[PDB]
Each structure stands twice: as C-alpha cells, then as structure tokens.
C-alpha cells in the first residue's frame, strides 16, 4: 500500500506495492487503469486527492482485465467519483457479473459487479485531454484481457508506455477446455501481440512480472523487463505447463 | 446440510437447520422460495434430486429478500437448472448488483448477481400448475421485502401457508436515514400487513423468528407462532430500537 | 422543437413545444429532467451549449418516468456526456429494458435502454451545487413515476419548482389488472402526494396537462395550474374513468 | 407468415419468406435459431404449436447475430416460454441493449432488450437431447456474428447443416473505422471460417443470400449456394466494396 510513484510526467503508480493501479493525469481529467482489490477504494482516491485529483476529477476507468484483484473497486469508484468505464464486451459481461462464473475459477474470486459505460473494440483509441489510449486485445488470462498503450514524456522526450495484462495461466486446463475451446491459440497470439507492442516502459498488473520494484523508489524501474522479454518468459512458462500437462 | 422436511402435502424445507428453503412440488413444475446461503446449491439440488426433481424440474424461483444468506445461490441455480427468477423491482435491482450497495450494510454481505426473469407487483399471483402464489410487499428489512403466500393441503386438507420475510433490522439507523427516508413508515405498514396475512401456518426465512425447530421432526412446527404474534414481537423490538435511538 | 424557454433564473425548458425537458444550471454542473423523444439528443445538446453548458457540464439526469416520449435520448446523452442517471427501482428496471414489457403498452414503445447509476428511495434528496432536489414517488401512470422538487429564484425571489409526472391512465385497465393489482390505491395516494408539494411553480412532462404554452414566451406558464389544481384535476378525470370501467 | 418448412428430419423453417427462424426439435426440448422481427413472436409460437412444441418445450434460443430483424422477439419469447439464450460476449451485450448504439447503424434500429443466460466461447458446443450445436465465431456483420452447425438424421441418415450468419457489410465503412479498426481483418478470417464449415446444408438469416426460396416450398433450397460458394461470394463483394472505398 504505497504512496504516489512517478513513472513518467503524467503517469503515476497509485496502487499498493504489489498491485499496479495506474493514474494518468490529463488537463481534461484523470484516468484510472486498474484499481486493485475491492478494498483498495478510498486509498485510491487518497492518492488522487494528494495527486491533485478529486472524485469529480476522475474521468475514466480502463482495465487490464476484470478479476477481483485488478478491478475490485470499479463499482465503488464509479459511485464515489465522476468515473465512467470503458471495456471490451468480454471484460464487460464479466465485470458485470462480479467475476462470477469465471471460465477457470467459477465463483472463487467474485467482486461486486459494475456496468460498463463504453464498449471498446480491438485497436480502438480513447483520447483524454489530448492523451490517446490504444487498446490491444490479448485473450488468454481472460477472454477480455487487454493491453493499453500511450505515449507520455520524461525529460520532454516521448516515452511509449505499454500496460500489459498478465500472460499467466494460474492452474488452468489449457488443452481441450470445453469452456475455452481455443485457449492455446488465443494465448499464442497474445504472446506475439505483447512482443511487438510500442514499448519504452512496460508495467503489469503484478509488478513482479515486469521486474518492477515499486518499493525501490527512483530505482523501482531499473531492472524492469522489456515487452519482448516478459512475452518470451510468459511463453516458456506456458509451453512448460503445456508440456507436463500433455500426458496424464 | 439436512434432509427434506414436509410442511404440507407438497411443501418441503430443503434448506439447513438455520436457513429456510421452501420447495413446492406442482404437477406442471416445482417452485423454490429462497435458497439460503450461496454455498448451498449442491445441497439444494441434492435435496431436490432426492425428492423427485431434476434441474429440468425447477420451474420457478421466488425470494423473500435479496440478501446473501437468503438468495446467495440463485445465480448458480439458474445456470444448473431451467429455473427462472420472479421478483419485485426493488429485489430485482439488488439481486442484480449482488447484494452490493446495501442501504444498511453496503458491500458487507455480497454474493453472485442474478437477473430477474419476471418483475412482479404488489398483490400479483404466480400460478404454477394450479398452485397460486400471491405476493405481499413488506418493505423494511429491505425495500423489496415480500411475503409469499399459498394454500396447500396437509393430510389432504387446505393449509394456508405464509412465507413472511424478516421484519428485523440488524444494526439499522431507523430515523433520519437519508438512504431510506421513509423507513419507520414502511416498517409499521408491513407489521399491519404481516399480521393480516391469510395465516394458517407461518414460515419465515429464519425459523427462529416464527418459532420453528427444523431438526426436531414433526414437532418442528409445534412452538411455531402465528402471523399476529410474529409481527407483534416484531413491532415491540422496533419500537424499543426506535426508543433506544434517542440515546444515539 | 423550440429554442430554450426560461422558467426561472437558472431553470429552462429545452425540449419541444409538446415535450418537457428542463435544464437546471448550478455552480457545480447542469442537471437535466427528462429529455423528450429518443431523437432529441442533439437538439437538447444544442440548447445546453447555447446556455453555456457543454457536454462535460451535464453531470446528472433525472426522470419523471421511463416512457419513450420522456426518457428517450437518455442512453445517448449518457454516451455523449459524462452525465449520470438517478432513479427509483421501478424506473430503473423500466429504463434498463428500453420501455419493453410495459404493464399496459407491452412492446409498442421501446427506446434505447440505459442503466441508472444511482437508485433512490422516496423522499431522497440530491444536491447539485448547493441546490437540493427531492424525489416524491407518485406511482400510477408508471409504478416508478416520480415528482421532482427544487427551489430556484424567479426574481432573485425564491420560487418553489415542482416537476410532477403525469397522473393519467391512457386506456389503462384499472380495476382487476393482474399486471397492477393495486393500481387504484397507488394512484389515489399519488394525487394526495402531488397536491401538497411545495409548489409556487408547476411543470408537467406534457405541458398540455398543467395548462402551459411554451410558445407564449414571456407568459407561457401564466395560465398554468397549481399543484393542487393538477392533482385534483387528475383524480377527477381518474374517478371518471373508474366509473366507466365499473358499470359502463 | 409462412407455415413450417421442413429442411431435414427435425429442422424446420417457422419464420417468413424473407427471414429465417429455425426450429430444431430434439428428444429433450426444441432449440430455436433467430426469431426474425420483433413482432414475430406469436407467429413463431403458433408455428411451434403446429409442430408439437408447447412454450415449455422451447428450451434454448441461439442467434446468428443480435440485430432487430433477426433477434427481434427474443425477449417476448423468453417471457412466454421456459427458453434460455446462449450467445457470445459481443452478441450478449448488443442484445442486452436492444440493438442500440450499433457500431454502424447507431440507434436507428432498436428492439426489446434481452439478457443472455449463457455465454459461449468460440467453438463451444451445446448439447440438447443428444444433438450437438457448435459455435463458430465469424465476426464481421456484427462483432458477435456466429454460425451454428449441428448434424441431424435425415431419413435415418445424419446430415451436416450449417446456419451461417450474414457476411455482408451493407453501408459499412470498412477501412479506418474508429469503432472498428480491425473490421477488414475480422471479415477475412470469417470468410475462411464459413468456407470450411461442416456443410451439407447451408442456411442464412436472409434466405436469398444463400439462394433459398421459401415460396418455392419443397424446391426452396435447390439452387442454393454452398458454404464454400457463399463465403467466397461474400469475400468477392467485400473486395469490390473495399477497393471502391479507397477511391473516396
Ligand atoms: Zn486475473
Ligand atoms: Zn492478478
Ligand atoms: Zn436480510
Ligand atoms: Zn437473514
Ligand atoms: Zn408516459
Ligand atoms: Zn407522455
Ligand atoms: Zn444484421
Ligand atoms: Zn438482416
């Protein structure tokens, strides 16, 4: 449960030390990318207030994916701020039933449900205060898993920021999943997708994945990974769950 | 986990010893009034299968009120049976946001969200194979709190059976409650209603309030109270909570 | 189809000459009350800009009732603006299903559905920029039918503004209606509700019911009935309808 | 207003000349595919009676895509029968908003909204009475466009039927469409998908697009294209629509 952490000029890390919750400050208003656990709600705004943003200053909420530890407070944040939610149809029906009936977890990770305001399509752009957010679909971890890119600045120099959802598969049945018949082929597109993302700075729903150390302060992003690296790691791990899995 | 327990020719208590779950067997389908806690879906069906009812058999699902311990498994149930859900507007909206944003409890007693299939109005009857269920709104415990009544036959003779919702108010602010300006006003009107219900037998979400010993055989409904008595003991505690409210 | 019509110092009519839609401007943002027909999203939006209110400025949307000729463009207004919708449970479920499955009209008037962001109980107050709006439930025309009250100033001289919903029953089955078993007792108390509203200035969804003439510019609401007169006039019309239905 | 039209042993066209509604009767309940125009609910139910399928015998509703002239009466059906709907994320959201905020038609084509009871992934199979229905996503005409393939038993002999959704882009802006950046990419993949469908018999939302003739009765589907032909024909038109588009 950290305090505001500058990543680039208009991008800050506002979610705890082991849970990315990105704040992108635009004149036209603020933007929240993920929000952590259902309980991290007021904390989120706290960092908002000190950051200069107030509830009515919250314009938009984007998600990496609609699970409880990453979209937990979306509903509470909407009630308490000026937030509207933009998500793909997949993230949207899932956000909407509170993470319930999860392809792989069922009801083991339900949060309170929220309604989406906008339905975005793969490669759709969202401009907030002259700041353009591009959506990159990467089905795998969830059918609606998404990647968000945007160019910020550091030294005045343009910095392309890729917010990549997990490429992980926490104990999933990959081959012949009747609930997700083409899981493997989706995940494989997703690896190559992240792999080619306009990436100067990468961040991930879990900071460990990108090698980020939010506790390291000015060093929190010194050994941080590349988009390519994290991709290939994630694949080595999947082909490693897919190998062992084959027989038995 | 208990075994079914006849109450009338076709009414059975398939819940637990501490959570009512009234199963009603009609020729052209079977009704379920409340289903207790969310984790009680297997048992609910378990109890149904062991009573001459498959998933294909659950035709209807009515509820006393949209709280976790009384409507928790309805989402799961629909997904596993051909069950439809009939409920009033107020319960329907609450069912749909998973028990979140509770007037009195907030997100403290959340559960998987479900969509109502039918919206019913005060005094509306639902007939499933010749059995008439008449809806009695009794706002208070929740805005949508209802009393479901129907005639059965015990030993082959008519038994008018009232499934009155909780008239309780665990930890509520009664007056000056901005989220429920007319609370006291509604609670009073409900007692008068709960008291004038066509009452031969009285069943309630929590067996205690009606005075029912579920795990005590056919002598379970021996110390069970009347409608009148239940609302009487209901107003008494309220008027004393309203009185204990001038303090704080 | 007209240009903005001022009612009070910060309260304008912006719909059409046959359809009411009120813009209430406050130091914290605009508040809209009904919107007319689905096709009117752009007109209303013109007027608001004419009035110095930009889309970002619309923050709240209130409704008399969720019929197509009054709640029509609400869904698009939500997409085109950051406004949020507040409504009671009945009006929230009827709005969410675009008007379909009407208790009396069925599916003959559907419009783009929408989600209420906030559900409100009877007598609940909402404050926008120091101004307070109070919801008065007046069930009948629709079971969600709401009267909205606030006070402005017509001469730097406080006027009580009452926006009350229709009290009509256009071809409604009154007594014996299975979709509305208690229609008669709701209307009745609804009359007695409208009658006693704080009401210097009265407005109705249909100008033609509270004797307004949006063309009359300077006067217009000068031969306009009072709340007592409206209320009384409806039950008169109402008590005429029942009479017929009964013996006739 | 056409009487049922036998397509195979247990597959009928119960719609109209111009629009395709398929009834697949199975040991365990009947399945329906598309319903046509919003007002077509009673006609279907009538045709369903003329085939021994009572409202309670309707179990599952499937969809090509959630446009008005194909999914129009799905909500009245769900209300008048014990039928449930299975659909993908894309379709389920468009259906949940009545065909409003269309990516290409906006809100000019609106119908009663309906909730999905089940969400399917690409290539997910749904069995009803031993009969297996497989979903093939063919994103294009709508993002949620789907093709359903089942195998009947014509005259004791199985048959491989293919209900492929429209593959048209009527008036669509194909290149650089803000709401649909990967449109063209999506279609190409969808042309491929239709081409290779298990396809003895091919049927389409609009009969003519697969050159059926519902007035031709027994003839009806005699000079009717093959999946292979249909697809490539659709790709052909798409190529001309594209190139012609690039030249302003
Ligand atoms: Zn996750
Ligand atoms: Zn995670
Ligand atoms: Zn409760
Ligand atoms: Zn309880
Ligand atoms: Zn109306
Ligand atoms: Zn009207
Ligand atoms: Zn279409
Ligand atoms: Zn069509």
Short mmCIF file of C-alpha atoms and ligand atoms in Angstrom, two decimals, chain D residues 19 65 67 69-70 141 166 168 205-206, ligand 8:
data_model
loop_
_atom_site.label_atom_id
_atom_site.label_comp_id
_atom_site.label_asym_id
_atom_site.label_seq_id
_atom_site.Cartn_x
_atom_site.Cartn_y
_atom_site.Cartn_z
CA UNK D 19 -36.40 -14.10 -42.69
CA UNK D 65 -26.43 -12.01 -34.61
CA UNK D 67 -29.92 -7.24 -34.99
CA UNK D 69 -34.77 -8.31 -37.93
CA UNK D 70 -33.20 -11.49 -36.56
CA UNK D 141 -21.58 -8.10 -39.95
CA UNK D 166 -24.79 -12.78 -42.82
CA UNK D 168 -22.47 -8.51 -45.62
CA UNK D 205 -30.52 -15.13 -41.84
CA UNK D 206 -31.63 -13.80 -45.20
ZN1 LIG E 8 -30.50 -8.80 -41.73
#
